[PDB]
Design an enzyme around this catalytic site. Structure first.
Site, short mmCIF file in Angstrom:
data_model
loop_
_atom_site.label_atom_id
_atom_site.label_comp_id
_atom_site.label_asym_id
_atom_site.label_seq_id
_atom_site.Cartn_x
_atom_site.Cartn_y
_atom_site.Cartn_z
N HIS A 60 60.51 -14.92 53.19
CA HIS A 60 60.01 -13.81 53.99
C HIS A 60 59.49 -12.63 53.18
O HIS A 60 58.83 -11.75 53.72
CB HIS A 60 61.02 -13.36 55.06
CG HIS A 60 62.38 -13.06 54.54
ND1 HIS A 60 63.42 -13.96 54.59
CD2 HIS A 60 62.91 -11.91 54.03
CE1 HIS A 60 64.53 -13.39 54.15
NE2 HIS A 60 64.24 -12.15 53.80
N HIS A 90 61.85 -4.93 47.61
CA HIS A 90 60.87 -5.83 48.19
C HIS A 90 59.79 -5.01 48.87
O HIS A 90 59.87 -3.78 48.91
CB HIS A 90 61.52 -6.76 49.22
CG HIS A 90 62.31 -6.00 50.29
ND1 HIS A 90 63.59 -5.72 50.05
CD2 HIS A 90 62.00 -5.40 51.53
CE1 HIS A 90 64.12 -4.99 51.06
NE2 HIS A 90 63.14 -4.78 51.97
N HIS A 92 56.63 -5.17 52.26
CA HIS A 92 56.22 -5.70 53.55
C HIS A 92 54.75 -5.31 53.53
O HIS A 92 54.42 -4.17 53.19
CB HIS A 92 56.90 -4.98 54.71
CG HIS A 92 58.41 -5.03 54.63
ND1 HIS A 92 59.06 -5.97 55.31
CD2 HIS A 92 59.40 -4.25 53.97
CE1 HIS A 92 60.41 -5.83 55.13
NE2 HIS A 92 60.62 -4.77 54.30
N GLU A 102 56.18 -0.78 57.78
CA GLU A 102 57.07 -0.92 58.92
C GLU A 102 57.19 0.45 59.59
O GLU A 102 56.98 0.59 60.80
CB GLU A 102 58.43 -1.45 58.46
CG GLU A 102 58.40 -2.89 57.95
CD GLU A 102 59.77 -3.53 57.87
OE1 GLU A 102 60.71 -2.92 57.33
OE2 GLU A 102 59.90 -4.67 58.34
N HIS A 115 60.60 -1.10 49.64
CA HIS A 115 62.00 -0.82 49.96
C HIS A 115 62.91 -1.03 48.75
O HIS A 115 63.12 -2.16 48.29
CB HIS A 115 62.49 -1.68 51.12
CG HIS A 115 61.85 -1.31 52.44
ND1 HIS A 115 61.83 -2.21 53.42
CD2 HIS A 115 61.24 -0.15 52.97
CE1 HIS A 115 61.25 -1.70 54.54
NE2 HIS A 115 60.89 -0.43 54.26
N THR A 194 65.69 -3.96 58.42
CA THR A 194 64.57 -4.30 59.28
C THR A 194 64.39 -5.81 59.48
O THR A 194 63.45 -6.24 60.14
CB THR A 194 63.26 -3.65 58.80
OG1 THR A 194 62.95 -4.09 57.48
CG2 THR A 194 63.41 -2.13 58.79
N1 LIG Z 1 64.63 -4.08 54.88
S1 LIG Z 1 65.80 -3.37 54.32
O1 LIG Z 1 65.55 -2.69 52.95
O2 LIG Z 1 66.26 -2.51 55.32
C1 LIG Z 1 66.89 -4.59 53.89
C2 LIG Z 1 67.75 -4.45 52.73
C3 LIG Z 1 68.74 -5.47 52.42
C4 LIG Z 1 68.87 -6.64 53.27
C5 LIG Z 1 69.93 -7.61 53.01
O3 LIG Z 1 70.65 -7.63 52.07
N2 LIG Z 1 70.16 -8.67 54.01
C6 LIG Z 1 71.23 -9.66 53.75
C7 LIG Z 1 72.43 -9.44 54.69
C8 LIG Z 1 73.74 -9.93 54.05
C9 LIG Z 1 74.97 -9.43 54.83
N3 LIG Z 1 75.66 -10.55 55.51
C10 LIG Z 1 75.55 -10.27 56.94
S2 LIG Z 1 75.63 -11.44 58.20
C11 LIG Z 1 68.01 -6.79 54.42
C12 LIG Z 1 67.02 -5.78 54.73
ZN LIG Z 2 62.44 -4.21 53.76
#
Ligand SMILES: NS(=O)(=O)c1ccc(C(=O)NCCCCNCS)cc1
Ligand SMILES: [Zn+2]
Ligand SMILES: [Hg+2]
Length: 256
Positions: A60, A90, A92, A102, A115, A194
């Site tokens: 993604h 990362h 978007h 976003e 981000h 997000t």
């Molecule tokens: N897009 S953002 O920067 O806001 C963003 C920053 C980090 C994560 C992330 O680490 N997701 C993995 C979730 C692991 C926790 N286990 C839960 S079920 C996602 C979006």
């Molecule tokens: Zn992000």
């Protein structure tokens, strides 16, 4: 989950009910309704001892990971209370220059958005931080199309190696300071991740000033694949979630 008609943002709520929560991200930043908050302290971004390790295509987006086992690249000051460690960053982006960010400013969408993810050190680790209301702090920065951003080309040149879902490659000695704009003026509000699991643990800090990247640089982002090797090719573009309702929240500004 993904960004397609059948598994996109409008379907996420079926597996992750919090999608319809009270503090979700992104949102539209209404500059005239935003409140200049004089108590907001200065942002302290300390990236001098940062250590990048790898770059990965997760299906993604691509994440540049950092060694967060010690305070090396941290965020503090501003609305934060305590130190947050940088874990990864990362982007978007869109399939066209006029969309991709976003967050939006007065309904204005940028071509991409960066981000830089940080977790609060008082909670021991990233997994614990996501179990807390003040567990994470993401520094958001908008990308507009214009001149090339020198500090971005090292990233852009490695994308050849991580074309499909699952690939990664060593990516050490990268300096994240080259992706920061001149000013640190920001907008701040309590939101969420997000992408699923969309947990509500983020103190968003979105910078007023955008950075510029060339038309050539964005295209290379568009050459990545959502799929893995040996599957119908789906160009990784438009990997962004639309603005969510602000609800009982007020966006505060560090400037005027
Ligand atoms: N897009 S953002 O920067 O806001 C963003 C920053 C980090 C994560 C992330 O680490 N997701 C993995 C979730 C692991 C926790 N286990 C839960 S079920 C996602 C979006
Ligand atoms: Zn992000
Ligand atoms: Hg949380």
């Amino acid at each position: 989950w993904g960004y397609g008609k059948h598994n996109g943002p409008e379907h996420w709520h079926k597996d992750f009910p919090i999608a319809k929560g009270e503090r979700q991200s992104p949102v539209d930043i209404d500059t005239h309704t935003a409140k200049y908050d004089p108590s907001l302290k200065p942002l302290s971004v300390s990236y001098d001892q940062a250590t990048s390790l790898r770059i990965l295509n997760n299906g993604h987006a691509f994440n540049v990971e950092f060694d967060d086992s010690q305070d090396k690249a941290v965020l503090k000051g501003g609305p934060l209370d305590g130190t947050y460690r940088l874990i990864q960053f990362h982007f978007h982006w869109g399939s066209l220059d006029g969309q991709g960010s976003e967050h939006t400013v007065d309904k204005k969408k940028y071509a991409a958005e960066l981000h830089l993810v940080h977790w609060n050190t008082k909670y021991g680790d990233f997994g614990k931080a996501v179990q807390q209301p003040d567990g994470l702090a993401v520094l958001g920065i908008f990308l507009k199309v214009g001149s090339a951003k020198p500090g971005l080309q090292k990233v852009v040149d490695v994308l050849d190696s991580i074309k499909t879902k699952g690939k990664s490659a060593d990516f050490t000695n990268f300096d994240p300071r080259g992706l920061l704009p001149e000013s640190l003026d920001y907008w701040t509000y309590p939101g969420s991740l997000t992408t699923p699991p969309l947990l509500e643990c983020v103190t968003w800090i979105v910078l007023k000033e955008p950075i510029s990247v060339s038309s050539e640089q964005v295209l290379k982002f568009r050459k990545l694949n959502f799929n893995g090797e040996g599957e119908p090719e789906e160009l990784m573009v438009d990997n962004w979630r639309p603005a969510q309702p602000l609800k009982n929240r007020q966006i505060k500004a560090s400037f005027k």
